[PDB]
């Protein structure tokens, strides 16, 4: 876990790739799985 104004944004690195991993996951579920 993180704590603090910008300290919480340390994991924003993952927020970018994760945001698309999730939205795109839906597409790559039945076709790729």
Curated annotation (Swiss-Prot):
Going by the entry's taxonomy, the superkingdom of the source organism is recorded as: Eukaryota
Using the record's annotations, give every residue carrying the modification Phosphoserine.
Answer: 5, 7
Q: What induces it?
A: Induced in response to nutrient ingestion.
Q: What does UniProt note about where in the body, tissue by tissue, this protein is expressed? A: Secreted from enteroendocrine cells throughout the gastrointestinal tract. Also secreted in selected neurons in the brain.
Quote the function comment for this protein: Stimulates intestinal growth and up-regulates villus height in the small intestine, concomitant with increased crypt cell proliferation and decreased enterocyte apoptosis. The gastrointestinal tract, from the stomach to the colon is the principal target for GLP-2 action. Plays a key role in nutrient homeostasis, enhancing nutrient assimilation through enhanced gastrointestinal function, as well as increasing nutrient disposal. Stimulates intestinal glucose transport and decreases mucosal permeability.
Spell out the protein name for this chain.
Glucagon-like peptide 2
Which classification does the entry list for the species? Answer: Eukaryota, Metazoa, Chordata, Craniata, Vertebrata
């Amino acid at each position: 876990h993180a704590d603090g104004s910008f300290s919480d944004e340390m994991n924003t690195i993952l927020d970018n790739l994760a945001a698309r991993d999730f939205i795109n996951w839906l597409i790559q579920t039945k076709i790729t799985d």
